[PDB]
Every structure is written in structure tokens, then in C-alpha cells.
Design a binder for this molecule. Structure first.
Ligand SMILES: Nc1ncnc2c1ncn2[C@@H]1O[C@H](CSCC[C@H](N)C(=O)O)[C@@H](O)[C@H]1O
Ligand SMILES: Nc1ncnc2c1ncn2[C@@H]1O[C@H](CSCC[C@H](N)C(=O)O)[C@@H](O)[C@H]1O
Ligand SMILES: [Cl-]
Lengths: 263, 265
């Protein structure tokens, strides 16, 4: 049940390709957006938890800017990469959201960059909003991105190819996007062909793996309700870590919100 | 002379059927219907038919089913062996690369080329092929073929960037990359194919990868009309994919028919 287990060793190269070819934000741009957002807030930010930290690309960006960072992810394979990047001092928590085994009065901000929250059902993200609210003091903030309208329009029909593929550094990926009838999720299947350890007779060989990435579309009305229900205010959406508004073409919606003084 | 169908021949028939079932390619009996109706409209009867670029013989088998006496020509030994299995020993199969057609004058009543073999010919090679076909046909015989239409290039080729598509079919996986090299008279469709290996690697099934370039030469309508006029044909007409519909900007496969004149070629 870890779709990133087979992806972890090539994830960083694929993330760079997605920046180069699928308009994903480089983590330094995410860092610029976060610092501009936090600088506009009254309460200073020193400690940051990134949930769904993956291989730690965003952790490293924030640490380079002087933040004291902690990461959380469910994937041991991804966290092994994050440990190699960050070294031994960085706290890395292996847990599956909505579980956040960490105490209140500790984090000034929580972030989730590059779409980990797309993997959570509505009830799982609701409980995650609650867990984040318990960790943040009044005036702390929560920032994350999820797929926008333009993503579902572009990769989940119409007129679009249902199968996509990429050949990158001797690995090959074949992606299939399916929308089950009457389901609250959409499915992206990763077929991956990777060079094998040895050869078959006199030919190079490849191992095939198949992994399902199940995504839950998150309407704006749902985000706003979840924010209100869990002690957040001033929820705003922007297009992909820019100052532009969310709109019909947005591929990645960036949400920011502020913890109230509620309990 | 590379043979891009060498690695494809084993799985070609399954892929061709997928393209009919899913990509609007004409079922071979629709091609047969179209040919029989077109030939029936001509004064000169048709019994003997040469299919150039016959591949694995899917169109040979359809024309034989309808009662024609068919001969096939293809450059790919791998494809032709499949045609030999399909047709048996009675059918003449010629291994030759167009424009070479080593067959006698006064032999064929019609020449056909179904499912896109002529897309692989440069304008010079297709001009020479028109000449060779003209020499094989008596006055009143006909030549029918299909090439990619305007809608095919618009759908699969982007002038600005490569396009990538894929298919997983019966444990074979294809990755297709479509490019338009600058200033070239061709466009490129690369086939990466993953097929099951002969043995396993440790405890995991293994796959072999092949890569083969399919190089296609767009053939504008004005060029077909010119080639027909230059090589002894008349009444050149285009239809959409072996139907009675006209060729149009959305057509994926342009079906051309033309009639041999009395000129000496
Ligand atoms: N319910 C869940 N709990 C914890 N981690 C989850 C999760 N669902 C998805 N993930 C993690 O979400 C990550 C998405 S990849 C994003 C990695 C990183 N934030 C970056 O900027 O590159 C994966 O590592 C995946 O394991
Ligand atoms: N210059 C050339 N000379 C001969 N055959 C050629 C050729 N260029 C391409 N071909 C052949 O064109 C074929 C295209 S596939 C079409 C197969 C068949 N007509 C059918 O209806 O399914 C391949 O078998 C390929 O080897
Ligand atoms: Cl961008």
C-alpha cells in the first residue's frame, strides 16, 4: 500500500522533469511564496513541519533559508532518501496522515508541498486539518497544494490521451488515468520499467512494476468548510505558488490559511 | 536498410486489430468492400491483384476471401513469413523494397497498398513506385492506396515539441514518440516496445526492450494529383478511410484511387 516504494529511487529525477515539463513549481519558488506569505503574517515563523515530506526536497529548501524543519511521511522508501539528503540531525517521522505524532506548542507553520494531500480522502483530510490545528498556535499557518481544475481537465478528459508515457534516464513510465463511475476518487496507474540487475541470455532486461496512485479531488467549497470547522480563517487559494488567483486553468491550487484563537 | 517491422512482426496483427477496435482504422473487410465496389464501377474486370507492402497478409487474406487472385510484396522477411503462414504455399509472396517490383507486365488487373506502407516512401521513392505500378497495369486497371491524412498529422504531431503516447496490450507495452524534425520532409514515430523475456531475472519476470524508428513522409493532395498525372494515371480521387465520405481536414487515412491511362510508361 505504498505507491512510492517503487518510485523513491527515481522520484527526484521525475520531480525535476515535472518542473521542466508539467509546470510544477521548483521548491525554491515554493520557498519564495512561503517566505512572502509568512512575512505578511504577524506571528514569526522559525519551526516548520512538512507533512508528506517525501525525499525532502522542500525540507532542504526551507532549511537553507534558516528554518528549523521536521518532516513526516508514510513511506519508508521516501524517508530513506530524505535521511540521506538531510543528515542525521533532522527529525523525520514515519506516520500516515491523519496521524501526526508530535506535540503542540512546537511548530510555527505546517506545509505540504507537491501534492501529498491529493492522496487523502475527505474524511482523512478533515482529520488532518484537525491534527494540524492542534499543532499550530494562534496566528500560525497551514499551506498546501492540491490538483486544480486545469489538472482534471487536462489529464482526466475530454480530448486528452488517457495513456501517457515518459522515457527518462533508462527508466520508462506509462501512466493511465481512469475515473471510476460514481467514485469520489480518480486513479492514476504507474507502470514502470526499470533496468534489471542482470541480463537475460545476451540482452539487457527490465523489471516491470505497477502502482496505483489514488487521488481525491478536493473542491474549493470543501476546503473552505474544513478550514472553518477546524479553527482556521483567512483561507485563500492561489495559482501554483504565485500571486495569481486560482482559476479554470490552474493545474495546482495553493491554499493558505491562518489558525484562529479557538480551541 | 533497417527493417522497423522486424521487432514488430510478432505482435503486429494484435496491434492492427487494436487500431481497428480502438483507433478508427478501417476493418480489412471495409477495405475489401470499397475495392470491390470501386472495381465493379470500372469497365475492365479485376481478377489478379498485387498488394504492395502486404505485411502479414491481412489484406491478402481478405481479398482471397472475396475470390481475387492475390500476390503480395513486402521488404520485411519477418512480416512475409507471417503472410506465408496466413496464406499457405499457393500465394506468391515477393520480398522486395519499393520502388523495386520484380513482376511481369501484363500480370495484374489492380494494385493496392492498404494500411499505410506508402507512408514510408520518400517523394522520390513514391514517384518511382508510381512509375513501376503504371508499368504493371494495363489501360483501365487501377491503383488504390492509403496514406496518412491531414487529421493524422494534426492529432499526433506537434510542431513545437515531441508528443508521447503509449499502449499496454496483452503483456506487450509500446511507447510511441512523435517528432517533426526541423526542415525535414518526414516526421518520425519511434516505437519503444517491451516484450516478455525468455527467462526470469531472479524471482521477477523480465522484459526485453527494442526501439525502432518509423519514418513517415507526408503526401499532400496536390502531390498525389501531380504524381498521378506524371505516371500515366487519371481520375485520381480521395475518400476518407475506405468509406464513401470525402477526404477532409479531420481524415486520419486518405484513400486514393486512380485509373491507368493508355500512355506508355
Ligand atoms: N496519508 C499519507 N500520510 C503520509 N504521507 C503520505 C500520505 N499520502 C501520501 N503521502 C506521501 O506524500 C508524498 C507526496 S510526494 C511530495 C514530496 C515532497 N513534499 C516534495 O516537495 O517533493 C509521498 O512521499 C507519499 O508517501
Ligand atoms: N519501401 C518499402 N518496400 C516494401 N515494403 C515496405 C516498404 N516500406 C514499408 N514497407 C512495408 O509496409 C508494411 C506496412 S504494414 C501494412 C500491412 C498490410 N498491408 C495490412 O493491411 O495490414 C510493412 O510490412 C513494411 O515492411
Ligand atoms: Cl510554472
Amino acid at each position: 500500500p505504498d505507491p512510492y516504494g517503487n518510485l523513491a529511487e527515481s522520484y527526484d529525477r521525475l520531480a525535476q522533469w515535472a518542473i521542466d515539463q508539467q509546470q510544477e513549481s521548483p521548491r525554491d519558488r515554493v520557498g519564495d511564496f512561503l517566505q512572502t506569505f509568512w512575512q505578511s503574517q504577524d506571528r514569526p515563523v522559525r519551526t516548520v513541519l512538512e507533512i508528506c515530506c517525501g525525499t525532502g526536497l522542500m525540507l532542504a529548501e526551507l532549511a537553507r533559508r534558516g528554518y528549523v524543519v521536521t518532516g513526516l511521511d508514510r513511506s519508508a522508501a521516501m524517508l530513506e532518501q530524505a535521511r540521506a539528503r538531510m543528515g542525521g540531525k533532522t527529525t523525520l517521522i514515519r506516520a500516515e496522515l491523519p496521524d501526526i505524532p508530535a506535540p503542540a506548542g512546537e511548530f510555527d507553520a505546517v506545509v505540504s508541498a507537491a501534492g501529498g494531500l491529493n492522496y487523502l480522502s475527505e474524511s482523512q483530510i478533515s482529520a488532518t486539518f484537525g491534527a494540524v490545528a492542534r499543532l499550530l498556535p494562534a496566528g500560525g499557518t497551514f499551506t498546501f497544494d492540491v490538483f486544480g481544475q486545469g489538472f482534471y481537465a487536462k489529464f482526466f478528459d475530454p480530448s486528452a490521451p488517457r495513456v501517457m508515457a515518459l522515457e527518462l534516464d533508462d527508466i520508462s513510465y506509462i501512466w493511465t488515468f481512469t475515473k471510476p463511475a460514481e467514485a469520489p476518487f480518480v486513479d492514476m496507474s504507474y507502470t514502470q520499467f526499470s533496468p534489471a540487475s542482470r541480463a537475460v541470455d545476451g540482452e539487457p532486461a527490465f523489471i516491470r512494476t505497477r502502482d496505483l496512485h489514488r487521488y481525491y479531488p478536493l473542491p474549493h467549497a470543501t476546503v473552505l468548510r474544513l478550514a472553518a470547522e477546524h479553527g482556521f480563517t483567512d483561507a485563500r487559494a492561489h495559482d501554483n505558488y504565485s500571486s495569481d488567483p486560482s482559476g479554470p486553468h490552474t493545474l495546482y491550487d495553493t491554499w493558505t490559511m491562518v489558525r484562529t484563537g479557538s480551541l
